[PDB]
Amino acid sequence: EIPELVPVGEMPRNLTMTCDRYLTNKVIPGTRVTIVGIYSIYNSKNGVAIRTPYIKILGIQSDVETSSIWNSVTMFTEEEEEEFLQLSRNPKLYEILTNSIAPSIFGNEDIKKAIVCLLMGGSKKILPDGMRLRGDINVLLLGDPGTAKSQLLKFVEKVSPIAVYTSGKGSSAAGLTASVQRDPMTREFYLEGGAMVLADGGVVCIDEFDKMRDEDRVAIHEAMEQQTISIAKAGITTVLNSRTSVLAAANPIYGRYDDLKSPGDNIDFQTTILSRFDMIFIVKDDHNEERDISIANHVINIHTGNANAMQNQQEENGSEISIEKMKRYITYCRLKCAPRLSPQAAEKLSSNFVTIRKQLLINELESTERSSIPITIRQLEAIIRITESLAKLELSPIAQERHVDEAIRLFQASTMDAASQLSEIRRFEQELKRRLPIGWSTSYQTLRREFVDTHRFSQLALDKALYALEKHETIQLRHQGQNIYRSG
Amino acid sequence: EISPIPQELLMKYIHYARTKIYPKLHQMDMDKVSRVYADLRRESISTGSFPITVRHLESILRIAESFAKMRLSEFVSSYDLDRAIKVVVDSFVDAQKVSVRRQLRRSFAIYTLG
Amino acid sequence: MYYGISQFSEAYNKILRNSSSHSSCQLVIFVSCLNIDALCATKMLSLLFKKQLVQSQIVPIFGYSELRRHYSQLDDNINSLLLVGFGGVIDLEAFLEIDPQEYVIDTDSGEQSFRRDIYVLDAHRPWNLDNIFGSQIIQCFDDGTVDDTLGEQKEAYYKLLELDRKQRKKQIHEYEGVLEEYYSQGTTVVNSISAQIYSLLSAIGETNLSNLWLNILGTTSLDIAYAQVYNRLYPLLQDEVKRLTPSSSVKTPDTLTLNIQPDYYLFLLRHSSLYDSFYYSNYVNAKLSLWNENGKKRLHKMFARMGIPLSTAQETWLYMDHSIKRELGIIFDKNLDRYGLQDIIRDGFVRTLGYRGSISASEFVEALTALLEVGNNSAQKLTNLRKRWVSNFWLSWDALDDRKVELLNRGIQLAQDLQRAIFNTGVAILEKKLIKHLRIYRLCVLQDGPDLDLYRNPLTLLRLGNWLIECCAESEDKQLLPMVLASIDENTDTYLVAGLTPRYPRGLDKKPILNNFSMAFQQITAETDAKVRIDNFESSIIEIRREDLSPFLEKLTLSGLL
Amino acid sequence: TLGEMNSESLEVNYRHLAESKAILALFLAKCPEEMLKIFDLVAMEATELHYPDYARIH
Amino acid sequence: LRKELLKIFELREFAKVAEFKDPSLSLVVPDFLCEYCFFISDIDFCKAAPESIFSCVRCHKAFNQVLLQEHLIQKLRSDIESYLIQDLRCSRCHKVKRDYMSAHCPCAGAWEGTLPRESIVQKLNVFKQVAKYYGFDILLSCIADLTI
Ligand SMILES: Nc1ncnc2c1ncn2[C@@H]1O[C@H](COP(=O)(O)OP(=O)(O)O)[C@@H](O)[C@H]1O
């Protein structure tokens, strides 16, 4: 039964039902369906006068479920297809899909863009040598409580056509992946699918990913990356396909993410699971008064009911679309468009990848220890999939460079922003506070020739301590970064 | 002499307020609570302070709704907002260390007393 | 006076003599939008002009300034103008700067002719004496109140105009006192535009089932606040239904039938559940006081007494077990007398065709009213908003066609949602007691509430107003008082103020009460410097600024013309 | 309040049968099945005296 | 006391209109000195009385209006020049633009001006208002040629 309509303090009751002739093989497990049928009674082989009830199905209807068992088949009607083509021809459908995700959540615009990229997904490719590459992206929202990450998980589970919502504490290794159970009558083992089998071709959402057990986290690695679960248990060996896009939410190991604390201490995840994730969105609370007053007004408008009026008016405005239309558009974009890349896009993509790897050199130089947030070749495949999803928004078969720079912007906003989180410093600060006075400026070439060519300090100490004085806001930069000015 | 209302009446009163009366925030102020939340986020900048999130504004809204539910009034008044803000401010002040309880009490005294 | 009923046909002939030309368009029908009666009236007129091939331009107008803008840009080729639902109160020569000297052609012999005819189809019984008597160009389709009531004012105006010491003062001041006694009188309606146009169609001979159904809708739409008009016009509709019905039968896809059958005084009975029909009805909540929890307990108790289970009552009327709905008249007769709901029993008109279901007149006019309402720097916002309700009016015109029943079902769903919003805001008003007693009038000001952007519409605020008048009319402990209903618009930042007349309870069976808000609104607008809008065709609809609201109400309660 | 939400259960306090007509309480304690077989008809007649045509509901 | 006083107007304690804003926008010209007593003062054209603006504060000797008009032209063109030479900062990183022409920062924030977009137009609107009030016809002509 529907979880929204369960009675108080009880369990949802499973009821056995039957289909005949062309009503068979119409529903995937996990969908929400309305069924019309007769409520008949049949005698079962298992007290007094107990005859078990069932429902003989006369009719199946489901807007969330489409095309029965999936055959990549176009069953959308012609005027709805023309309306969907009109939506794909819209010049600002990207902002429409961004505003469609979480209308009652202020901020988190890059998270909403990554969610839309997760819902559209990449393109699955097949090579002649059997090389299968991933066509889905996995996004991990790591951050402080009160950032509405779990509400984003719930809204992703609502919008997506195939989606399941799971826990970290309520999970298990045989629960997320497929389990091996025993049939009672035959006494033979059989595989019953888990949460990543019910989400095949769709979205799995994990809440409190930081807390799920260490033996429980690592049964997911082939199901995230290889898109398959290889099970050899109880005399049954098989490789089931699980094409699941993973959306996980987590807090750091410490209670809140601390900017004073090192990023290695906040994350006790292995580097493998962050290599598998594609958007590692680390979110914080900066306590800005404008942001606090804006979120205060927004949540007040949500609680009073005025946000119902604003979203109902803005739907008729045409800048937002509902759950059903966006769900069917996700299904149509996955079933119609699977784009390739232009040759000029590959130069920009490879150049940005070697640029961010060269930046990872600079990130891992001075700390001398390995970063907990790695950028590997799988992250280049991630940016490829982001570009292909950005092409899949507007049914574009060619992923041009305009989509490429937005993909680069999303990756810099998520993963490069996440990865960027003794006597020399104090001696530089004293020498520079005595060297240039309050209200006067110095060129960077003067500091280079007098503090590096003199070998008073290193160049890395200069580059770090200029930023250190910048964030202290007593000495800032002016005139295109070529002047250092003491604000005083 | 130990309680104004009898317990047998009070339990049924709580059950009837829970299952029948659903208050709603319509004619509320909804600007004083914004300044209260902004000031709570500003004074939650201390290292060992009680954390304030968006959930605490929503907590103020449930405490005001529960205070409106206690009177069996389907609409929330501004007095219920004042009492909810007083409870949340008093909890935040009692959570703070005694070096700054006087400063934190004088900082939010304009919202609770008036 | 210029057109009695027996010569409406003659007036139509004059329209043909100015407009029956294939080469050019010469007839423009100005229709008051946001009125069901004018919508049905213009639908019958458009069918009549389509059957005879008269070129036409139907223009919906909201405001008086919108009327002046549309009349100012009219071409000189147009010689026939029809003003539907308005133009009976103001002086059209003083408003549209009409001077007969530049509009006269071939004055030669005491005969006068003009190059433009402006016909008025107005139901507001305050008639301007210059307009109805001293005007040749402005031609009125009078119901017949001029021949019975307005004779003393006719002779007073005629000896006022004819005669341009004690004798002169003694007669002229007496006639001016009679004329100023007829003026400063409240606004009322005793006849519908659809009835007058159907009388014209009876005089011509173009009556059929569709025009009769449109006349039934136009008469039925006045049953909310003008029940004496519907009770007067009901036997003529009964005679016409029994005249144009066929001889008899089996349900077949082509036979449209239109029966006089029991159609109870309920909100959307045949397109909603019985529980939702009793729960959202104005009369049921008016008597049993459904706004508090005791009224809901009494509604559930009478569902127990009627023998209808709440599982069956909340089921859709079309899917309802007919062991409940076949003998529902007997159950209504046996059970509603103890709860005071005897006046639910009412015979109305129910039309069906084919196998697509039956529709009543009341359900159809609430669907049309909902399609008027929510069917789809500040001056640009007002212009766009007026364009939005003109688009709503044309959507409701599209719903009048037989082949567009999907628009009718959309109107049914919109009526259900709008009645839910009206019920929520009505119990919002009643729970916190925003109704204030000011000893001459009752004041209700909406400062904030659920979905307050629906109340920038006039008819939605009138729906809330009729909800309040029905709810307060059955409470005899407070007497009959006029109501001021103000709703705030934050983006426009204006209080839209509606004046509502009280009424007697429906069970009683006299002289109708008048609308005395327009006189006070005009006098306060003249005396004070309030920046207000008088342009609405219903003169009890004004727009005030927020900052000028309380001085306007203080000058209103100081004035004794309420 | 049985008729209010279409309930079918009528609660009877046994102490009320102890205060008045204690022979009925003794007969209910000794032979409960036949006593309830009379009692449901008695309660149905008492309901129909106040809510006529209640048998269509339950 | 303010809470009790705001009850009679039917306003809440913390309303949008109930809070106070300064009704005078500060227009100051820096270091305008008289030639007589050499008192170097900053003249505020909005918050001062008209008697103390056209004359010296201590010497009480009237300035000619022509150099006041010239100094307002200098202040206006100083504000316009400060708008046109302008660093662009990140919306998130708050980092100055080093590479002079690029789409976005490595933090992927947009470029915004260090001066606000509305600050210059409020300054120019207050200049237009003070020119319309005090009758500086040269400054009115400057706004006329600036708009065209
Ligand atoms: N921007 C926002 N808009 C609306 N509600 C918010 C916002 N941020 C936080 N909230 C509220 O605060 C709560 C945050 O919970 P959440 O952070 O999702 O839990 P977790 O820490 O497990 O992810 C939610 O219930 C949500 O209603």
Ligand SMILES: [Zn+2]
């Ligand atoms: Zn001087």
Ligand SMILES: [Zn+2]
């Ligand atoms: Zn940046």
